Design a protein around this ligand. Structure first.
Ligand SMILES: Nc1ncnc2c1ncn2[C@@H]1O[C@H](COP(=O)(O)OP(=O)(O)OP(O)(O)=S)[C@@H](O)[C@H]1O
Ligand SMILES: Nc1ncnc2c1ncn2[C@@H]1O[C@H](COP(=O)(O)OP(=O)(O)OP(O)(O)=S)[C@@H](O)[C@H]1O
Ligand SMILES: Nc1ncnc2c1ncn2[C@@H]1O[C@H](COP(=O)(O)OP(=O)(O)OP(O)(O)=S)[C@@H](O)[C@H]1O
Ligand SMILES: Nc1ncnc2c1ncn2[C@@H]1O[C@H](COP(=O)(O)OP(=O)(O)OP(O)(O)=S)[C@@H](O)[C@H]1O
Lengths: 721, 343, 325
């Protein structure tokens, strides 16, 4: 109800009546409280609403002292009988004043006002008007000041607005050590955004709230300064100093250990300096004016480069991210806040896994926030879904994260079935033979899905064999099964090389040079798409400088960029290709991959491909030769897909191909030295060419047949009508 | 003294005395100043105390006009002699109110009140602005509007004027889930141009309109922000921050919640940062301030590489491209829009 | 002065902690539990940090070593492990991806954008990291493929430990540690003349080092460090370690091996994979390809719900807990 100051003045009125041996309390006794002390700082006595308003404080002093002498000496027992209606009314009026003034507590000024409004000198010896406006003016110009300049974190903390923080006790102590300096009063927190800089300032506030602060700072209070009053609050040229200088001086003395702080101190460098608030502050740094700032490391760098002065006042305080275990500790401290915020229970394992998840899948975010996001997001997820529950650790988190960050890998299937149990079948259905390539694909994904693959390495395989054997097709089909979308594959022509390639590859352009589109094909796409299948079109012909660079993705997945940042791959499957082995494939020694032969190939590949790459690669995969037996399946597969891809079914075929057509293809388009690719030449050269002509001649109205000639031919529906 | 809002009204009042070529400014010119133009945020006329007080502000304007035509002269050379003793009193009364309120400047709120104390309609059943007690009941809702700076997407959606979505419901659900968060409340739609990120934000408006959103977001008023308000409304250093702060404060309190939408985040990020206004939003972003944003993945790149601050305020959401069949579904959803569009 | 300065400037080298028993004295031991063999390499780094902490390191220069030998000999692994030991965090390693480098260099590494040129993100990757983080350890990956102009300018830090940027600012973090790597020596370790590389062979390595790098580098490096091939008993040891580390790292340990590697599983990995030119990585890949992928399937099929074992089947295979145990 009352401020401590208001209570003091009222209390003094009461106790002065006791000390002066006076019966019922009168307006006189509150006036006695007003003149209770010689201290000029006491507004009720010298730096008064009277003295700086309209009348000599002595006039009033003598009104009161005359009256105090005039009231007769009583037995101590009644010395302060009651406030009666007289002081009751003054206090009630002080409350009416609060309502008029919109003041949350009764001020000593409300007591000064209310008393003065009711009061009049009781005797002819002194006269003075109750100059209400003068006393209000003087009251308004005193004490109330920071609500116009900075947000009072400490009182708001007393009011429960503070978020307590843990695990930063040294960082908090560091700000204390700096704040405890006698000369260099200015600390600043420097680090990554999301590192916990504001959190540390609030940590200081927590230290203040629990009064765990050294005498120099023991009475401290924190206030959030800048942008509003320092920028929005400006229309005139001197507005960088009006209000700003004002508050700097308002807080230098008496009013406890006021410490302002800046959360976004980046501004305080000035756009071209020009003392845009920025210089006046350090200009006054020889004393008081204790302020703590906060900036990111790069913003720090920028304000340093753009100023050269605040840095002589401000102590650089480095803030490091916590370890995963430490992150969990803060998560635990924060856990109940989240359970409350969302009305859901959270498992300790939720917190544990959130933190390690973040380390694994959120490289662009710091652990404090990243882990918290996984928690607060999961909780929010449930809060929305709550119309139905609680948060369940990795269950909720893996799904939640995958939904936002990508990586469905962690969701686990409703049924593993086609999801890597029967996948070898499904892959063998799309492509024929080459089961080891198929197994490699499945295994790559299975290890990823199971959390077993070495996390530092993307699945990586190099595919050897004769072009036309399905090496690209495999990669595309992998994307097919990986995303249920074959166009999500990333494919780079790795053979387009000379040394002049930086940006075309993950290296990017370099900032400071023309062009700021970097590694678009790889770096930008990788940043955007957390995983894919990356196909390198004949690494056999790629320049070795690039291959050496690609190695970095191949293993130890970290990826740099000319932007000064990194990408850091993880879950992208990479596929490299070569036909070196064609020199051995053309031996035609069985459809199966032969021992020794395949080794001569891989040996030669190393000779013509840095083994350093191959010494990191998950494995080299070799394709089976497409024997006619393989063809006997492939032809149907391809004719089916080829037809299905032909726009819409306004015609298409009945396809009475039977063995006769199949064999023709196996006897005519079947080049032992070019895989199935020449069968496609046959198919288009014969089947589609005739078809196109029949369509062109409008000899087909709907459907179509394939009729073996002894070659192939088509039928006529309308007779060239 | 007076601030810009009060000065605008006062300026208009004096202008009106000259618009009517009258030697002096009268209370009627001020009442006319209160009702100048149909700009909703004008508390003196439309989003006013009058409507809240159950009065017809246009009828009142007819009253004002009936009084303005009774001005005894419109003689040119005689015009513009004095502000009048009558309004001396009113402006002095405004100063008294400032003292009553501990206010360092006279706002339109105060100048309204002061005239109202001295205003009248010579009518028993006055069609006047609601009497002073109501003036206080509603005037006290002020201090202690966004439509000036943004389009109410939710209201447009309530009025239809919206194109339905398909498939993107999942990123919408993600958006709702992010908005529902206590700390990082801001989802952002990131991806290729043309994917449907605007379509998603309209989809969000639909969910609000359709009551498919939990109460804490259900009542949200979704707005299309900045650009014009940000820069077209600018002239000088700091007035970006002023409009920003104004809006941010509005969304900070009382009106359940307001959600702001930023389509092209690149519009922010200052200029090499330099805290060139943009930063205020991140600065205050901790106070819930539910915001939805968007950006081209490459734009995201060009700003995320530089910023780092907004990243702790928003949730990155990739928006997937629909398959051909899904695309057909959108075409089907929009089919009636197209048939209507061209007949 | 040391403690308060350290809290603000890091400088752990100025602490002189009572924990030296572990904090350097047992460093070689601790590192040998992480790194198999490569005794001299372990000692080389350890020696440098001992001079740092003892105040004997000369402020004019960072610790500097060149790691030569078979890829998969643990060259970058050692470097990471000393980041681990030295700063209690392997991820603090500022690996310098030197082969990822063109003549543009500047920003992506140590110099940054010449001030006044567009892009005010300057030396973000290396210099700014030191600017922000007084010192750490840096690892120069495959310096053989670094652009020559860059190899040359980085010499300003190699000795006369200066770091002048395009920002117009200087860091001079001579307190750091740098490790350079190369596969240059692989051609001589491939002589396979015992597991430990002998004299003459090392001279050939150094011959090649001189062909690749100038005295302007080579005589500034604290030492060239040449890595050995692992002994068959040593790979036995690395196998044990890696298998344990992999499972220990395995996200949530929802599944769990008895890890009955016995002599036999370990021998199968060693015998099946120990080519003298392989590097330890293929043994690690082998177990992933031999068993772990089978495990993944067993998990997916619910053959492994919890726990797991090791079993040896001659050829190799993996047992199940077929009742979804
Ligand atoms: N040590 C900690 N104690 C308590 N809360 C923490 C801690 N670390 C992080 N947080 C959480 O992190 C969020 C605010 O993070 P901060 O690190 O202050 O953000 P910030 O990094 O200060 O913002 P910048 O980077 O200066 S814009 C809050 O929601 C806190 O719950
Ligand atoms: N093993 C197979 N199973 C099923 N269909 C196949 C198979 N092999 C090829 N098809 C054909 O294989 C051809 C694609 O050839 P690929 O071997 O992927 O080209 P490759 O790859 O050479 P690139 O592109 O330089 S790696 C297509 O024209 C398919 O019709
Ligand atoms: N589900 C949907 N997916 C895609 N587009 C849709 C969808 N529903 C409606 N549309 C319409 O298709 C267009 C999608 O455009 P936007 O979402 O603006 O594209 P964008 O992702 O915002 O990229 P910009 O910035 O508009 S080029 C809009 O003009 C919508 O009217
Ligand atoms: N002696 C060893 N002690 C511990 N780990 C080892 C050892 N040798 C190899 N490794 C493993 O090898 C992998 C890293 O191998 P390194 O030989 O450092 O790679 P690298 O050959 O240094 O890379 P380059 O060739 O310089 S790009 C790690 O996954 C280690 O587990």
């Amino acid at each position: 109800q009352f401020t401590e100051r208001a209570l003091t003045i009222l209390t003094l009125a009461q106790k002065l009546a006791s000390d002066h041996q006076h019966p019922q309390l009168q307006p006189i006794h509150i006036l006695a409280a007003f003149i209770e002390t010689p201290e000029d700082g006491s507004v009720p006595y010298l730096q008064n609403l009277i003295e700086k308003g309209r009348y000599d404080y002595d006039l009033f002093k003598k009104v009161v002292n005359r009256n105090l002498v005039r009231i007769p000496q009583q037995q101590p027992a009644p010395a302060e009988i009651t406030p009666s209606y007289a002081l009751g009314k003054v206090l009630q009026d002080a409350a009416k004043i609060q309502k008029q003034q919109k003041d949350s507590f009764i001020a000593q000024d409300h007591i000064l006002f209310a008393l003065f409004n009711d009061s009049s000198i009781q005797q002819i010896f002194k006269e003075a008007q109750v100059d209400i406006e003068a006393i209000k003016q003087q009251a308004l110009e005193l004490r109330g000041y920071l609500s116009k300049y900075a947000i009072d974190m400490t009182e708001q903390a007393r009011q429960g607005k503070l978020d307590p923080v843990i695990g930063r006790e040294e960082e908090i102590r560091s700000t204390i050590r700096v704040l405890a300096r006698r000369i260099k009063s200015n600390p600043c927190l420097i680090g990554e955004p999301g590192i916990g800089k504001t959190a540390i300032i609030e940590g200081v506030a927590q230290r203040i709230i629990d009064d765990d602060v050294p005498t120099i700072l023991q009475g401290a209070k924190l206030f959030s300064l800048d942008l509003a009053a320092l920028t929005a609050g400006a229309k005139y040229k001197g507005d960088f100093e009006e209000r700003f200088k004002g508050v700097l001086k308002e807080i230098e003395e008496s009013k406890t250990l006021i410490v302002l702080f800046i959360d976004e101190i980046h501004m305080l460098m000035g756009n071209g300096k020009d003392d845009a608030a920025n210089i006046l502050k350090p200009a006054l740094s020889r004393g008081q004016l204790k302020v703590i700032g906060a900036t990111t490391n790069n913003e720090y760098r920028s304000i340093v480069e753009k100023d050269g002065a605040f840095e002589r006042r401000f102590q650089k305080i480095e803030v490091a991210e916590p370890s995963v275990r430490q992150t969990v500790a803060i998560l635990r401290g924060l856990q109940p806040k989240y359970e409350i915020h969302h009305g859901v229970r959270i498992l300790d394992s939720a917190l544990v896994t959130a933190a390690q998840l973040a380390k694994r899948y959120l490289p662009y975010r710091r652990l404090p926030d990243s882990a918290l996001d996984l928690v607060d997001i999961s909780c929010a997820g449930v809060a929305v879904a709550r119309d139905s529950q609680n948060v369940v650790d990795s269950d909720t988190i893996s799904e939640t994260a995958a939904r936002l960050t990508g990586i469905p890998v962690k969701k686990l299937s409703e049924s593993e079935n086609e999801k890597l149990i029967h996948m070898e079948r499904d892959l063998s259905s799309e492509v024929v033979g080459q089961m080891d390539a198929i197994k490699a694909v499945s295994n790559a994904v299975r290890l990823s899905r199971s959390g077993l693959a070495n996390p530092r390495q993307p699945a990586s395989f190099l595919f050897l064999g004769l072009s036309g054997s399905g090496k690209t097709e495999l990669a595309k089909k992998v994307a097919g099964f990986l995303f249920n979308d074959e166009d999500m594959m990333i494919r780079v022509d790795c053979s387009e090389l000379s040394e002049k390639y930086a940006v075309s590859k993950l290296l990017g352009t370099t900032a400071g040079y023309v062009g700021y589109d970097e590694g678009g094909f790889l770096t930008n796409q990788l940043q955007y798409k957390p995983y894919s299948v990356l196909l390198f079109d004949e690494v056999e012909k790629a320049h070795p400088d690039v291959l050496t660079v690609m190695l970095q993705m191949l293993d130890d997945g970290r990826i740099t960029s000319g932007q000064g940042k990194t990408i850091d791959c993880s879950n992208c499957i990479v596929i490299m290709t070569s036909n070196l082995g064609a020199e051995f494939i053309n031996s035609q020694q069985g459809s199966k991959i032969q021992e020794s032969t395949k080794n001569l190939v891989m040996g030669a590949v190393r000779q013509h491909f840095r083994p350093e790459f191959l010494n990191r690669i998950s494995s080299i995969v070799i394709f089976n030769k497409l024997s006619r037996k393989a063809i006997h399946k492939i032809v149907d597969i391809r004719l089916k897909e080829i037809e299905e891809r032909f726009e819409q079914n306004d015609k298409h075929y009945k396809l009475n191909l039977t063995q006769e057509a199949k064999d023709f293809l196996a006897k005519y388009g079947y080049s032992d030295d070019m895989g199935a690719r020449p069968l496609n030449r046959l198919i288009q050269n014969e089947i589609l060419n005739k078809l196109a002509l029949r369509i062109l001649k409008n000899e087909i109205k709907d459907k179509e047949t394939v009729n073996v000639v002894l070659e192939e031919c088509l039928e006529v529906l309308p007779n060239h009508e």
